[PDB]
Amino acid sequence: PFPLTSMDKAFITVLEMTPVLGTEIINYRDGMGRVLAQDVYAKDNLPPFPASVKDGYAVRAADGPGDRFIIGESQAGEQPTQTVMPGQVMRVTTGAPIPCGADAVVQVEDTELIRESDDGTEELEVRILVQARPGQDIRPIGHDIKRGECVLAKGTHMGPSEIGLLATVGVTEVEVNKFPVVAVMSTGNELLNPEDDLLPGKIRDSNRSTLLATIQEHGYPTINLGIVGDNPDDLLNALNEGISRADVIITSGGVKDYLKQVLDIDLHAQIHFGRVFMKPGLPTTFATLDIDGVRKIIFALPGNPVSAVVTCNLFVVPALRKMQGILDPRPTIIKARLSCDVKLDPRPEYHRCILTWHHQEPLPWAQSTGNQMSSRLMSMRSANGLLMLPPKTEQYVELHKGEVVDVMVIGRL
């Protein structure tokens, strides 16, 4: 059928053939997880006014230390109207604007109250005990951000901190790369919907639910194409619907080999590989299709539920991340210690696992759970790692508990 594709060559071809989607303008509030398709410039200064850093008094530095009359108080949110003349000071709180006269702030810890108003219970006169430097304890106009300054670069992968920054500079509408819409379907004559009761010779479709859930976890919009009969007609119709509705199409199952036939002869698509030297995921197939200057990508994942979710994180997720504009869509790889003994396969092997960090230990531990369909570890934690086990060699044939292996992060820790 298809030539044997190495694990690295398969991955590289996925990222290389996966297109980067177009751009759109979105509101800053919806910017979570988006990639900037523009530079963001501030149109204001921050702060727009000179502001006090400490609670105390705004002083004319040239006055130096001595006794001064307090002409009023600068309150945050109101631009002061009074001008401080020599021998006078103005009471300031943190964040309050500095009046026209002063050029420095002396903190209240460095002052002593001398006289209070005859009544009204207001401070009247204070003794400044320290010689302020000009500009001391003041955040000058544009100290944090100047107008015309670039605050965010094109390509920035935005999180909550960036979104607040957009709110700061007043950029509420921003151009970003579109998110991929992903269509997911399952093929097989034995598959029934989860909502259905079982019938003889049938089982429930779990691949679809898991795959959609995995893609949703990354914040991408999905399309449920439901269950397709293992025949060219319903299969082709399903693909045609996926193409007109989505940017990515993912299917699982269907080993003849009706799917590979449809993509090649009917859609005139390019199947880049149909087999990959890995465990699990051997019959993983990846194809691209170009329609009207737009490239659609198609994933044919194995029917086995474990193989599906493993290959999804290995191939689909990095592709989806490139598509949304992420400059390094490559997954995060961390070093960890095996919790259990493991036998090595001639193929590179992958297992779902849970990463746990112990305070008295520098490295995290990885506990296998990818031993499904026989013994399944009932943990209260969801698997957040993908164990990356090496292929067997003439010398090393087995890995022992405690030994350091590579683990691929596949979720919030």
Binding site: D8, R330, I333, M388, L399
Partner: peptide, 9 residues
Amino acid sequence: FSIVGTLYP
């Protein structure tokens, strides 16, 4: 890089 495990003795 490569998504294949790298062993250390």
